[PDB]
Amino acid sequence: DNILYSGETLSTGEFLNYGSFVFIMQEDCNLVLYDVDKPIWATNTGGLSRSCFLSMQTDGNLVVYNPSNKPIWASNTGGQNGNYVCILQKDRNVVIYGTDRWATGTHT
Amino acid sequence: DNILYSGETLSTGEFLNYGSFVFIMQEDCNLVLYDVDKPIWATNTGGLSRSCFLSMQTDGNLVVYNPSNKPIWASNTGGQNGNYVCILQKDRNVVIYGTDRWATGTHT
Amino acid sequence: DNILYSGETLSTGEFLNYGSFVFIMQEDCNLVLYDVDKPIWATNTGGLSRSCFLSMQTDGNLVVYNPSNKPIWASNTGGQNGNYVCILQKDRNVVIYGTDRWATGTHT
Amino acid sequence: DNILYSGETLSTGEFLNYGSFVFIMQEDCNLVLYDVDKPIWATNTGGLSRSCFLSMQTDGNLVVYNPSNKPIWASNTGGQNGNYVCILQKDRNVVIYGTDRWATGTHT
Ligand SMILES: CO[C@H]1O[C@H](CO)[C@@H](O)[C@H](O[C@H]2O[C@H](CO)[C@@H](O)[C@H](O)[C@@H]2O)[C@@H]1O
Ligand SMILES: CO[C@H]1O[C@H](CO)[C@@H](O)[C@H](O[C@H]2O[C@H](CO)[C@@H](O)[C@H](O)[C@@H]2O)[C@@H]1O
Ligand SMILES: CO[C@H]1O[C@H](CO)[C@@H](O)[C@H](O[C@H]2O[C@H](CO)[C@@H](O)[C@H](O)[C@@H]2O)[C@@H]1O
Ligand SMILES: CO[C@H]1O[C@H](CO)[C@@H](O)[C@H](O[C@H]2O[C@H](CO)[C@@H](O)[C@H](O)[C@@H]2O)[C@@H]1O
Numbered sequence A, B, C, D: 001d002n003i004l005y006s007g008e009t010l011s012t013g014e015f016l017n018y019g020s021f022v023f024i025m026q027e028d029c030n031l032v033l034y035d036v037d038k039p040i041w042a043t044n045t046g047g048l049s050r051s052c053f054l055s056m057q058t059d060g061n062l063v064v065y066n067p068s069n070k071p072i073w074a075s076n077t078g079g080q081n082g083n084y085v086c087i088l089q090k091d092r093n094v095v096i097y098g099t100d101r102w103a104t105g106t107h108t
């Protein structure tokens, strides 16, 4: 999958992926974007903890929490409560979108 | 693919798809959401033209244009110029998100 | 997913899918290949039962069984015990391959 | 895509991919299987050339050729002319299957 929907959570070792791109939430708490084996981006918080989990919040903030729930990193885009999506785009860019503007409402 | 990014266009017969869900821009100009062979949603503009094309605009408006460029249908969510995405979600709901809030900027 | 590996089973309502193609094992026991809403192929065994399940066997036979385990349909390609795969190809052709010839053995 | 069909070719930098798994035909001619950034398997032919291309042949042989068309590596599973598939399985195992046993013939 390449979309982390608001209200979801990438646990340790979990990741979004598309093509050769992998946005992985590592064990050492380093959220890294790899292009195959090459590191492309990273929160550079590796080692600050263990077993962290990336969380896309409804307020719009993309936060990396440690097991103790202390936030290690965050996009700081928190504020408007609503629906949001974190997408690992086809052009190798992880982007946050929101709030939702329209929907067919065909939701299950 | 299950994401129509703003600035993109589904031509006739083109579609977003995910699982058994297919959000197709048909020849008869009817934008329909199918769950396998069952119709789920539709703009109900079938027959109003031929060779239409769905366009996700930068202003946020999701418009169905005919070859003559006259809009046959639209979400009317036009307004704020920016980046938007139309996603055929995993829960069978086509939703529009925007503007973009954050990005790793790792864009190619 | 677009691959049913030998030893696996599509239950009722389950399906392989790729693009707009959906190879679905229906409730009425009719294994049908749809191209969006258009039926393309089918075992034409609909109604012969309820709650059937498609099974890709290790002997190479692709069988549609009813809950009572009586085979309703089968490719009759049974014979050589081994590894096989049923693939819903990108050209809209469901094909069976086997046995396996080579592998990196990198298996988890 | 995670299937290289017989008669197809991964050029330099091209790759099969699934999940965090990427079976890439590198510039240095090293066909490597990575699990994110960790190398898992490799033909160990890196440096033997430049701009190689992986080819899944109809005879069943999986060969890595150099631009000069000299084979640098091969699975040596050549022999029976027919249809074959190289699949980067969900269990992180690259496997070759063939020949084809059955098909709905729905081919486009
Ligand atoms: C400096 O290493 C940290 O940041 C790198 C990117 O800047 C990551 O690649 C790295 O993770 C990978 O390597 C470490 C070992 O150095 C390993 O523990 C991890 O599982 C990855 O393989 C680390 O986060
Ligand atoms: C300052 O709080 C915002 O930013 C923090 C990280 O910089 C987040 O931890 C914080 O999230 C928490 O509070 C919000 C609002 O109460 C809640 O919705 C979320 O689940 C966390 O508990 C917020 O984003
Ligand atoms: C009433 O038919 C229109 O709207 C339906 C949904 O309400 C669509 O399913 C339908 O499209 C499909 O059927 C038509 C023929 O009726 C066919 O031209 C089209 O390619 C689809 O198969 C149509 O849009
Ligand atoms: C003749 O109907 C059977 O075979 C068709 C293909 O030849 C299928 O499309 C059909 O399944 C679909 O329609 C039936 C109702 O006729 C419905 O029960 C099923 O869920 C599908 O929508 C059926 O198998």
Ligand SMILES: CO[C@H]1O[C@H](CO)[C@@H](O)[C@H](O[C@H]2O[C@H](CO)[C@@H](O)[C@H](O)[C@@H]2O)[C@@H]1O
Pocket (backbone or CB within 6 Å): A037, D026, D027, D028, D030, D032, D039, D042, D046
């Ligand atoms: C020993 O290096 C070769 O084999 C490795 C696996 O055994 C590959 O990872 C490696 O490729 C990667 O690194 C090289 C530089 O050492 C780089 O040229 C290539 O693009 C990959 O990043 C190489 O094939």
Ligand SMILES: CO[C@H]1O[C@H](CO)[C@@H](O)[C@H](O[C@H]2O[C@H](CO)[C@@H](O)[C@H](O)[C@@H]2O)[C@@H]1O
Pocket (backbone or CB within 6 Å): D057, D058, D059, D061, D063, D071, D074, D076, D078
């Ligand atoms: C010994 O030939 C087989 O193995 C070689 C590598 O070990 C392959 O290069 C070779 O392939 C070539 O010949 C076959 C048969 O003529 C042809 O189909 C293929 O396209 C290559 O030209 C064969 O696999």
Ligand SMILES: CO[C@H]1O[C@H](CO)[C@@H](O)[C@H](O)[C@@H]1O
Pocket (backbone or CB within 6 Å): A083, A100, A102, A103, A105, A107, B089, B091, B093, B095
């Ligand atoms: C109630 O939530 C659902 O519907 C909204 C819009 O109606 C979507 O944005 C969201 O992702 C879900 O599909």
Ligand SMILES: CO[C@H]1O[C@H](CO)[C@@H](O)[C@H](O)[C@@H]1O
Pocket (backbone or CB within 6 Å): B057, B059, B061, B063, B071, B074, B076, B078
């Ligand atoms: C009123 O203009 C807006 O809406 C129409 C359709 O309603 C689009 O054609 C146009 O580009 C704008 O999005």
Ligand SMILES: CO[C@H]1O[C@H](CO)[C@@H](O)[C@H](O)[C@@H]1O
Pocket (backbone or CB within 6 Å): A089, A091, A093, A095, B083, B100, B102, B103, B105, B107
């Ligand atoms: C310049 O556009 C790119 O970057 C923005 C955010 O920087 C994304 O929203 C967009 O989809 C592209 O990837």
Ligand SMILES: CO[C@H]1O[C@H](CO)[C@@H](O)[C@H](O)[C@@H]1O
Pocket (backbone or CB within 6 Å): C057, C059, C061, C063, C071, C074, C076, C078
């Ligand atoms: C004759 O036996 C074979 O074929 C039938 C269906 O024809 C399967 O049920 C069985 O497991 C074997 O594959």
Ligand SMILES: CO[C@H]1O[C@H](CO)[C@@H](O)[C@H](O)[C@@H]1O
Pocket (backbone or CB within 6 Å): C083, C100, C102, C103, C105, C107, D089, D091, D093, D095
């Ligand atoms: C033991 O089974 C595994 O390995 C064989 C080849 O070794 C594959 O064909 C099969 O799908 C599994 O990945």
Ligand SMILES: CO[C@H]1O[C@H](CO)[C@@H](O)[C@H](O)[C@@H]1O
Pocket (backbone or CB within 6 Å): C089, C091, C093, C095, D083, D100, D102, D103, D105, D107
């Ligand atoms: C003629 O080739 C097509 O059909 C055969 C079986 O008929 C498949 O194996 C192959 O991949 C193609 O789809």
